[PDB]
Design a binder for these strands. Structure first.
Lengths: 295, 81, 289, 81, 289, 295
DNA sequence: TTCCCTATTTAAATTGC
DNA sequence: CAATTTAAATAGGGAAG
């Protein structure tokens, strides 16, 4: 079924599940496998995504790209993309990198603004932990959690170098892993190659975190290779640098409580897309990158 | 000149094109004839596969070439089927 | 495990028309309107540039984008190409690409290199007969394109620099090989429909040079009124003036069909490693820093 | 680089070989894949042909010389069955 | 019907072991394995030689010997061949060759002109390896035996004088390719087996250079007490000691089986057109008047 | 089945049809398709001929090359040659040329006894007509036949030019065709291009007599390329010379009777082969060449 | 797409010749 | 010596998810 997901102010990102897409009566429509045909709105829709089970005709492609809709392709749930043209201001008359690209490369090429943007994205990591509250896992308002939050805030506000910020992020992730592990009372140590259910579940949640991060950066049309925390040679470091907002506050409690129950990966995917829609986190990352770029 | 015949025709006419191109080439993969040959022999094959009767479907490939293509049911555009 | 060939190791291509790029036993098959399925070489395809009547399946789009074969729509002002995004591209090349796009003095040099790569494709891909490659009528057009792209004072200055080169090449090919077809998109013949499914094949070897090696189509080398379409159209114009229009003119002069022109374009891109040249040429300008 | 693959195996292994080589070469007819792969591409194609396992009946061809051949029963000077 | 493609561009040559050569579906064949029937291209086949446990029936013979394709047999030594005869071969070559060949001075001149052609067989075919074109010993020995056939006192003075050449090239190619084998028709090692099976390539090329152009062989050159077989060994040894001996020492040195050795000599025949060379090479001795 | 042909003094040309010749107990024997194996004599054999269905092996060929025989392949009727080895003095001790072309092209390279051999070979064409008789068709002892024998004897004797000889041969061919036609009460002219039964039986008989030429020259080591009457550029002119000894004598009434009584081509070949084996025509051609050779 | 038909093209084997 | 069978045999199809 079709899904509405907020980007900035209107539900302009459409997720189109199992169907066939074609031109009907001189306008772009789509036909599900149950026999029900739906058209599209055009002023409502700016972004249209396609999931497993779809095919779009070229006439519909040209009519969508003719007067101001940009199509994209994605995995199941709409929160990991693999094929997309990249965003312009108006996709027909002009072709240039966006003003989000413009202010983002201004803050990337300015070293003081580079460090200020790094401090601000860790400050939004603070605000993501303080904002996204969950009934499971640790409580963000207790003594230990908020003490580690205050220690991180002192760490970012008193740091100058990039490696100091990386060390603060490192003790943040090990500390948060320790208290989340203490919440369900099993000892853990982080390693990517651990083939247990808990670590593979956390890497799956991390995968959908980089998917929602990539959908956020494509939603502003900004690329994937201008990181703030990781180095310039890190493979897709900007995707991790926007995803670690969500790994430390959303992916860790969801994946950790769901692998406490140990249910299936496909239903975890469905629940992750459901929480991504209900919390409306993609628009929160657009709000984050908009307040970084506009300063 | 290493040329390469690939036939696509049928059951009965494939036996005749076998008998008239394995005289000139050598069968390797399932229908893929290949071997060294002359251009005079190339013209001789073109003559005796005009004179094989209608219903043959054969394309020759001297390395990367479409040298003679007599008969066609459906070639799917760029060098395929 | 399964390291796979790079986009600089992919030589097959396709510009499918009236097709249906579906999933057939894991192979991305472009099934045309006749009733047969052309199994495209998905890992070795630069792209599968769709035309009118083509429906690209979602799992087929997944197998195309995962193997770095960025499908595109051809039917240029409005030609949207779905570049591959899940497989993360070269971050060292892409980070220095914006640093060579944001600085206007560096953006001018990057645009000059990306538009003078067309002159480097008429001398590397030397499979051009009829109008030749040193006949001083097509080589003169390539030299004039290089002279126009050498300055490249702004992205809006030489925005339509490839358009004049394509017009000169299409005029010289017609004046040489006995024709009078001009630059048109709806002049239905064997000539103007040859360099409209041949330039789509030139965008076939351009969407694999910006989905694995290069940065993106958003930051283009040419921007302006007559520079709409993206940097894929600025990577196709390197191969359009050397491997698309000369092959189309040779097929029109020899009376070949559109399928023969498509096979000739795919074989000339495979033998000259034109997709590999585009993939290794985008990395030269991007990863120069 | 111009190589050519013929598969002589049995089902369902032959469909698997079709899936592996059809990602690298376009199909011509009655199992003779044909086209252009770089040498590292032929090396990793050999690697996935090894990872297919037993039962593979593939002989390659670089012009007339056999570039590689994985699995065989009888293949003389000519290459006929 | 047809022009019946000329033997000086015939392009295949075969030795078979443990088979039953016959016609299946109008096609002369192999039976190398138990049920593995192959195909012989009689319009390109120079010759079909047959090892132990082999036989060719009459339908294969009648289909085969209609355009100049011989059969001889393996078990140097005594060999009865089968040249095509119902094809009325051109007469001028054999008229002029008996016109010289009765006169023992002009027969001696024919022997000295076909026996000096060892150097020409090393001259038009140069792509070797190891000892290559010259190891500063093979050029010397072929030069002294060129002078030895340049003198040419009598036919019985050179009855087994070429046998010294073949044994000195057996033990001249072995001082650099390390083995101490000797000439034996029943030795089970790789060197003697390969160098014996290559004599059955040389005999086929020689007898098919005589069958098509016109000489019936048994009217001999280099007759005596040891060189038994006729003019065929006076034409087979042109390519034996110059062409098939280096490839035989290669294949016995690299240590691969007989089939890929025969592939190497089939390719060396095909890319250099060696019975073409042997057709217009003895025509410069036959047609010469 | 083994079928015999005499050549010089002893019956030695055994013809094998439809058999598998291989080594039985260290000796060359032939297994026919009926299932019975028969051996071959050795000291009685110099020529051995393989008709259709005949397969010989390699170890058998090795013994046959080791102990003194020459083997040949042959077509239908076991007589028409297509694939052969050649005749030497002795194939094991010394491989020296057979003396028949020694005598014959010694007498040919000088013009005077070459012309003597030409008039002698038209003399044995005359002897082929006068010697060999049939029970049907034209009697060789009537007025017209004896008249054209006397006219041809005169026309062979006085002349010294080969143009007069070939004109006499053409006059003989046309005149004998006219008398043979009026004996069968029809009017006819020879044409190779006509496809009637009479002309095609003449052409098939001419081809089979070309076969008897090529076989009788192979039995002595003389070759098919050496004409006496036709020119040096005529391919196989000696074959058309030696067949013209018989083409007016035995092939002509057999073919004319086969065309008159209307049998098929294969049984006409069988009747020709029966006449060729019963009245030793090959041996008479050997005797002809041997008396033309030694002079 | 994995999967299962399922028409096919297809051989080489039979098999006189 | 080709006179034809039988299949070794694949995309080519429908579903599906």
């Amino acid at each position: 079924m079709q899904k509405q997901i907020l980007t900035s102010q209107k539900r302009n990102m459409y997720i189109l599940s199992r169907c066939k897409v074609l031109v009907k009566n001189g306008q772009v429509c789509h036909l599900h496998e149950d026999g029900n045909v739906y058209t599209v709105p055009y002023a409502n829709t700016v972004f249209i995504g396609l999931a497993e089970g779809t095919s779009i005709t070229n006439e519909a492609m040209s009519m969508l790209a003719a007067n101001g809709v940009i199509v994209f392709w994605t995995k199941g749930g709409g929160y990991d993309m693999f094929a997309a043209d990249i965003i312009c201001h108006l996709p027909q008359a002009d072709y240039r990198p966006t003003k989000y690209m413009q202010n983002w490369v201004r803050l990337w090429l300015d070293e003081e603004k580079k460090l200020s943007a790094a401090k601000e994205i860790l400050k939004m990591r603070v605000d993501s932990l303080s904002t996204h509250v969950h009934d499971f896992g640790v409580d963000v308002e207790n003594k230990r959690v908020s003490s580690i939050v205050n220690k991180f805030d002192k760490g970012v506000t008193q740091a100058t170098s990039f490696e100091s910020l990386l060390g603060h992020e490192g003790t943040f992730v090990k500390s948060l892993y320790k208290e989340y592990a203490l919440e369900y009372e099993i000892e853990f140590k982080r390693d990517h190659k651990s083939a247990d259910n808990y670590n593979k579940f956390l890497t799956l949640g991390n995968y959908y975190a980089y998917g929602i991060a990539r959908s956020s950066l494509w939603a502003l049309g900004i690329d994937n290779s201008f990181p703030l925390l990781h180095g310039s040679t890190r493979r897709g470091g900007l995707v991790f640098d926007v995803a670690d907002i969500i790994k430390t506050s959303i992916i860790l409690p969801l994946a950790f409580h769901a692998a406490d129950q140990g249910m299936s990966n496909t239903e975890f995917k469905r629940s992750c897309v459901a929480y991504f829609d209900k919390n409306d986190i993609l628009a929160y990352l657009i709000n984050n990158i908009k307040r970084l770029c506009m300063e | 000149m290493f040329i390469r015949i690939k036939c696509f025709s049928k059951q009965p006419i494939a036996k005749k094109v076998s008998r008239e191109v394995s005289a000139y080439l050598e069968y390797t993969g399932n229908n893929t004839w290949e071997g060294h040959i002359s251009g005079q022999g190339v013209s001789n094959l073109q003559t005796k596969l005009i004179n094989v009767g209608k219903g043959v479907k054969v394309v020759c490939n001297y390395q990367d070439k479409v040298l003679f293509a007599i008969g066609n049911v459906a070639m799917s555009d760029t060098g395929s089927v």
